[PDB]
Design brief:
The protein is α+β, with helices and mostly antiparallel strands. The chain is built from 3 helices and 7 strands; from the N terminus they run ααβαββββββ. The strands form 2 sheets. A 4-stranded antiparallel sheet has the order 2-3-6-7. Strands 1-4-5 form a 3-stranded antiparallel sheet, covered by helices on one side. The protein is globular and about 40 Å long. 32% of the residues are buried. It binds 2'-deoxyuridine 3'-monophosphate (UM3). Its main location: secreted. One of its GO terms (biological process) is defense response to Gram-positive bacterium.
């Protein structure tokens, strides 16, 4: 059904907000993007840059993926992101998260034709 590329956009792209803002951002976004459907997804990152800029990372610095694969890339420029981390008192289906804004280089895995992001590996 949903392609890996489309899933990446649903899970990691949010260009509408320059920095997400609002302490409720993650609680609202993790739910709206259906990341709390089956379970409370532990951690998830939203990137506040244009789709084009994020897709372009696939042609940037080639770095090893955490899983050992070689199709991961690190952005040369830092990007505005928001990490969503589940709290301790968080109990499904009422998933709770802490919203933390940051400016770091992102690392994503890319594949396909067009060669686009299909997984968010890390931020550094
Ligand atoms: O800083 C991080 C680290 C991990 N994840 C993610 C990557 C995965 O989701 P994913 O392949 O769909 O993109 C999941 C399992 O690690 O959580 C983020 O969003 N940000």
């Amino acid at each position: 059904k949903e392609t890996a590329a489309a899933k990446f956009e649903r899970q990691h792209m949010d260009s509408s907000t320059s920095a997400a803002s609002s302490s409720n951002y993650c609680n609202q976004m993790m739910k709206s993007r259906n990341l709390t459907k089956d379970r409370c997804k532990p951690v998830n990152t939203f990137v506040h840059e244009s789709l084009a800029d994020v897709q372009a990372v696939c042609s940037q610095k080639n770095v090893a993926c955490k899983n050992g694969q070689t199709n991961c890339y690190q952005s040369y420029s830092t990007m505005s992101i928001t990490d969503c981390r589940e709290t301790g008192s968080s109990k499904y289906p009422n998933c709770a998260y802490k919203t933390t804004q940051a400016n770091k280089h992102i690392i994503v895995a890319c594949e396909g034709n067009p060669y686009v992001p299909v997984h968010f590996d890390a931020s550094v």
